[PDB]
Amino acid sequence: GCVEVDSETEAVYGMTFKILCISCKRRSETNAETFTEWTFRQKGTEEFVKILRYENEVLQLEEDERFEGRVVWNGSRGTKDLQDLSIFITNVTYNHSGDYECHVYRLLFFENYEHNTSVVKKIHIEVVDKANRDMASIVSEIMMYVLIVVLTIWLVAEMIYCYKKIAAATETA
Amino acid sequence: PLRRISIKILVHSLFSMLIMCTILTNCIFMTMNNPPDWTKNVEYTFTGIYTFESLVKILARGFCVGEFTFLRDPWNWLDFVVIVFAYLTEFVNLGNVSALRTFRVLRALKTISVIPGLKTIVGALIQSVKKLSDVMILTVFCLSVFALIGLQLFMGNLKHKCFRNSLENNETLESIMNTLESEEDFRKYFYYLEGSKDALLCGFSTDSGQCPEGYTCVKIGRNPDYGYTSFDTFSWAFLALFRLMTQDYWENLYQQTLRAAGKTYMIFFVVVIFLGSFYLINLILAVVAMAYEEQNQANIEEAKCSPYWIKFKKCIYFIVMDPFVDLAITICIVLNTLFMAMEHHPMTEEFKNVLAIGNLVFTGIFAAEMVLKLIAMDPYEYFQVGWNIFDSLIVTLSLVELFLADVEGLSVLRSFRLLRVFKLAKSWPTLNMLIKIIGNSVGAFGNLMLVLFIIVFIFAVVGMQLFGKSYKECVCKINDDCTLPRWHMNDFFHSFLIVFRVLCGEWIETMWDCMEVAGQAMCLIFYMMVFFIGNLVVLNLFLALLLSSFSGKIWWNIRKTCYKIVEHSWFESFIVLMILLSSGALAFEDIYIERKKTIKIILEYADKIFTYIFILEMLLKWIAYGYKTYFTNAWCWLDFLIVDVSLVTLVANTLGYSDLGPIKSLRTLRALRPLRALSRFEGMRVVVNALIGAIPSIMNVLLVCLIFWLIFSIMGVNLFAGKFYECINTTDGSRFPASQVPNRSECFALMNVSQNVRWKNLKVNFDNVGLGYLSLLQVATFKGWTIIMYAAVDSVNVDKQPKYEYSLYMYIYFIFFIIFGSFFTLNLFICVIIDNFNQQKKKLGGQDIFMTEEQKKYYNAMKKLGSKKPQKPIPRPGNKIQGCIFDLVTNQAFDISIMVLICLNMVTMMVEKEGQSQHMTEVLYWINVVFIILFTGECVLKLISLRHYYFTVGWNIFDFVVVIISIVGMFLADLIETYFVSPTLFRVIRLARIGRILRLVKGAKGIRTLLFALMMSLPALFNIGLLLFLVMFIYAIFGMSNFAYVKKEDGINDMFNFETFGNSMICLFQITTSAGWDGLLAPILNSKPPDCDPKKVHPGSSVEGDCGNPSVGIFYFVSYIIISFLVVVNMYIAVILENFSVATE
Ligand SMILES: *[C@@H]1O[C@H](CO)[C@@H](O[C@@H]2O[C@H](CO)[C@@H](O)[C@H](O)[C@H]2NC(C)=O)[C@H](O)[C@H]1NC(C)=O
Ligand SMILES: CC(C)CCC[C@@H](C)[C@H]1CC[C@H]2[C@@H]3CC=C4C[C@@H](O)CC[C@]4(C)[C@H]3CC[C@]12C
């Protein structure tokens, strides 16, 4: 089912990058009609400006030149009950670095009851020149190799120590 | 003179025949719920016959009018009371006629006397009931303790509901709760799941159920199930604990309690289900079984042109009796069976014609051979062979069926062809031995079946008279349509069906309806009497009968070096630690692994680490042991296969060949790595060795039961093939009126004109012999059986809409299948496996096959611990005050008073309630404080007088520890409830009061013996639980890998699914008792739309589609329930039977 996964925080210049915004329902069997709002403040600027709105099944984009012709939608398709509100940027540039906000406006339908919900997700990405491997990935490989060599050393030491002792014991009898 | 001839008539044999004839017709006449007016005449005739009996016995046994020998016989008291009651009805009317009529069913009890075999079985019933006295007391004690625990932990949880959280006309929860009357009103303010009669439960914890957005979760309103499912009071908690003990619809209790309290409260259930159900049910079984053996052993000891066709006769004789013809005839039987098992619903006409010609060929062969074997033998001698007359009867049935003018209705004849299959028993070695096992004591089985039928008849009539009118006068409180439900007691057949279902172990839903419609007291008394008499006693006597019926030299130096290294204890400890780490790494891979990126990478590399380590271990074992020694060993073969699978997967990943069809399925085999724990822990090794030595006999019994189940499955295919299609309204899942859409064509016309209409079939149906086997498994395990039975009794024809109870009398098919298949087969499996266990114990030389060596030593110490001799008295101190207190406390009256004080404290704990006033809380608090003072004073008094020899008694140590725990728990609970804020921790701490109750077993001789049996049984149960945990782990990983991303339909929901480790183990523990396996199987069985969607996005991951593999699902669930049966049920029973014999010795 739906699993809330956080976006990545590192886009590589010239390439493409997908920004994740997933907002589950508390109960999956419920009915809802969700639309979406994204706002973005560039680093070194203090204002969240609106960039795009996706409702029904149409995507509306503003006139900001930082995103024209290079943003497409990557959420739930043909559902009207979104639960996944992601964004794709083709041809990432240096201007796509700052703080993102994925506003979620949900309307649940109940027996004789209608609820307006709101959830705001905060995403902060920075564009770079060359992707650098995660510190966990760097550390884990080194630890794997050192563990392999340590186990091999321990095994060989035990083999040598046991061989000398048993070879000494042969001459006794 | 007249009295003498009266005696002479009384002793006449005609008396019994006429009287018993009357009672039989009367019993027939008691089954009419709306008798006509002419029935009153024959009713008066019955009263006249019975008073005639009474008068003749009076004259005969009234040598003097004092009537001395008439009242001797208790049955004569029964006759007198029925006569005086009947004439009370005749002379006067008081207004209790239905109750007045209720008593004359006891005239069915005369049937015991006239058949001599019944008195033996009723003697067994009485002696079995007599010896259940200790076990019923122990059951009341244990259920009371567990009911106090459940009342403490879940006192008000089941009243939790989802409240609207936003009210409009300036209201409050109280103002609403005063106004609401009906479910339609409740649904406005509370969250109700679609099609449910109860509001959805939620909890305040983070691991409990979640009330949705816009709803806030509050304790208000009634409990579920009309209000009878609760822990609000000791009586309702006791009902819930009895329901848990009998495992009757206990999975509902499981799921509501977990959804309201929390998923971490499943420890209660585990402890309760494992220790309370099993021990006490198998204790009841053990007591009944040993009572019957001892009684049976006592009984055994106490009792001890013409000559032309004569020449044709000779010729045909020496031509027809060669060994060839019989083997060919059995081959004909097998071929006929294989042909007749190839029937299925969408059968092309060609294939139908094929079976038609095959049927003609086979029936011709059998009838012809019957003629040729008739001609050569004298008919009076030809009928001597018991098998041969059976063959002729089969031939006559097959000829009348074939050559009668074709009729559509008579498919019973069609189903009758199956009976040829039993002729295989003429040559089958094991089946003949089995029928011999019955034939030694078949009188006992017949009399037991007769007693069971009489009991079910009597209870059916009593239920129909007592509760019959209620079900139709207050018909609505139990059905929203104001029409009668599926199970009721308005007719004789349906009352009989309810009593049969209670005998099958399902008594609480029909009981909820009963109490709702006709009062709690009567319904409770009726159902409890029925359950006790049938299920606990008679159905256990059956299993008791079945159980009794079964009774360069440098290379060599290198090799030695590797040998030493591998045999070293540190090496084994390191390897076991690696195995456990590898299994935990498997457990970490949920559907949430995307969020845990770091842990994902760490396990990605740890997998390579473990593969390296285990390849190194394999190589060292190769160098040390050798190839012959290594590959001659099964455990090493298992390890070798797992390492090869892991290496193949790693190489495929390294070479870039990953993301390949077949290879992706080699990653599901990663769930098999836990299997290396089997070779390292001795407990599961001994338990597996116990299970392996019994497979040879399980195979033969399985073969016999497969033949029987195949006959039943082909009968079901004949009766029900393609008739379970129904044309439903998918919005609410309701079958159409069957007068709007009579058949399939109009249903498709509806789908063409309107949407949300579907011509839907059942997922587990009787469409072919393969699916018939699954349906029989559900019917035999009583899980999902009602869904099949409802569509079976509703079937009309193939392309016709079902009608409500059109084929009502198809219930008899399932009654017969249950009786033979379920009961006989499962009991036969149990006895065969237990007898094989006993054979193993004998071969080993009287050694417990469920214990390791150290467990054996500790178990011998435990045995020594419970057969001790009197110890030396504590010497009297001479301080002249210590001496007086020594008298005072050594006196028996002291311990008796302490026991009555403990009983009073138990009663004080029992009166707690949900919603009790603050004054009540204070009063009970202070009574408990005074009790604590009394017990602390008793401890202090024993310490002064007995000095330091107090700690030389095992029970005194327990009492002293309980005193400490009670004082500490009281003070700590006060501190938590005053200063800290933790109601859950406050409840868990206040659970310490229970320790005062457990002190009551000190002065109970029977409870002590049975608990000592459990204490000595504990090690083997620990071994079995260890192996069961390993199996549960493996199946949890495999279901996590396969059955996540499934539609969540019947038994799969937001909390009980296969998405994480905890959820999977919760589901698997539920299914260990075989409870609800149909509901979890059903969402997996659907594979193609509109049942599922193979292109579902599942946000947060890249898995696509939500519907499982029927093959994998069926294999999964069937194998798991079979393994759980074999492991827990049979071995728990065996350990209980051995240790009960040891303990009562
Ligand atoms: C299938 O059932 C649904 C309801 O279970 C039917 O829809 C109802 O139609 C009536 C028509 O008068 C309306 O008054 C109800 O409000 C409808 N209910 C719902 C929930 O929409 C539907 O008509 C049924 N379909 C068929 C073919 O009978
Ligand atoms: C769409 C239709 C044609 C699918 C049905 C396919 C038929 C031919 C299949 C489905 C299940 C099969 C049966 C499954 C199990 C058994 C039991 C075995 O002991 C004898 C054969 C028998 C009875 C099989 C014969 C053929 C069978 C009936």
Ligand SMILES: *[C@@H]1O[C@H](CO)[C@@H](O)[C@H](O)[C@H]1NC(C)=O
């Ligand atoms: C609440 O729902 C209305 C429509 O019903 C919508 O106009 C409004 O935007 C929602 N609330 C918020 C905060 O967006």
